[PDB]
Amino acid sequence: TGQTPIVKANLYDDYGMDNFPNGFNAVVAVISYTGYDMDDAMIINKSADERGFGYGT
């Protein structure tokens, strides 16, 4: 399940990239809270993961 970007270039439509979704709009908190993402790691919500966030085959 891809999504169209909220922030996109005007040329996103001109090449019809909506025919080929590439990602998903995610709620991203820039926060040092977990301790498990310092060098370059990132944390994904478990519940969002169980709701099909970023699923593929």
Partner: protein
């Protein structure tokens, strides 16, 4: 990864109750550390979080094509005005509460919506563990490749690292004890690895190890030191053979040198 080269592996699936939550009630699905930005300097990701929040609030789409803003019309000002006109603040911060202690966090937290891509480099294609398995034929070392259940390689630099630590038994355990350790047989008399064989026994006798190089034919030599081959050619000769602990690539190197017409004599300690 975001659309700003902020790649990173997923380190934990944080449970939603333990996730921080905002005054609105929402809990972010992605957490990115603030320390990813000061050296990478991806301010586009900041302004994209700002514009994405404003767009998802006003039900609009914002364009991000470069060189539409300038230093007199800053995207920070633009999307901040759009955020202020909706009830959120100018700078995109939100009052969040710790999900473990329930207290409000020390400062407002920068949140927003950014577009995220899932790359094809899954961990299910990268993990590999070997205890024992198939080996190469001419070296008896583990085969190569994850798809064949083959071991990983301890190269020259890893060998130097093991020597630098002074860990001699570590180097032995890596390069010998768990790669191609074989208990070969060496003729004590001539010191050749591969000129020996097991003898074909008679009825009720026991096979022995005997050297071909250090044995003369029974015919040429005009009951204990007589041994037989499969062909029946009797021999009376070298029974001064022992057992050592060598690699197997050593034996292959011995064969490749014999093909060159070069002999190697190995002197054993107890004679």
């Amino acid at each position: 990864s975001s659309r700003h080269g902020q790649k990173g592996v997923c380190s934990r699936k944080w449970p939603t109750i333990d996730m921080p939550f905002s005054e609105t009630g929402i809990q972010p699905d992605i957490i990115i550390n603030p320390h990813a930005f000061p050296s990478r300097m991806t301010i586009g990701m900041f302004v994209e979080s700002l514009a994405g929040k404003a767009g998802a609030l006003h039900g609009i789409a914002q364009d991000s094509t470069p060189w539409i803003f300038n230093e007199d019309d800053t995207p920070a000002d633009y999307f901040g005005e759009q955020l202020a006109k909706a009830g959120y603040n100018y700078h995109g911060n939100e009052p969040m509460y710790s999900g473990a202690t329930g207290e409000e966090l020390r400062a407002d937290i920068y949140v927003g919506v950014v577009y995220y891509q899932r790359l094809r480099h899954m961990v299910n294609d990268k993990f590999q563990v070997r205890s024992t398995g198939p080996v190469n034929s001419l070296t008896m070392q583990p085969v190569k490749g994850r798809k064949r259940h083959g071991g990983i390689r301890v190269g020259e630099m890893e060998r130097d690292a093991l020597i630098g630590h002074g860990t001699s038994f570590l180097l032995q355990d890596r390069l010998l004890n768990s790669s191609d350790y074989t208990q070969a047989s060496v003729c004590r008399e001539c010191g050749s690895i591969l000129t020996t064989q097991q003898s074909v026994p008679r009825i009720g006798s026991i096979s022995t190890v005997c050297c071909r190089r250090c044995s003369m034919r029974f015919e040429d030599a005009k009951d204990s030191q007589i041994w037989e081959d499969g062909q029946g050619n009797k021999f009376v000769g070298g029974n001064e053979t022992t057992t050592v602990a060598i690699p197997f690539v050593l034996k292959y190197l011995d064969s490749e040198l014999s093909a060159m017409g070069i002999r190697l004599r190995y002197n054993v300690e107890p004679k």
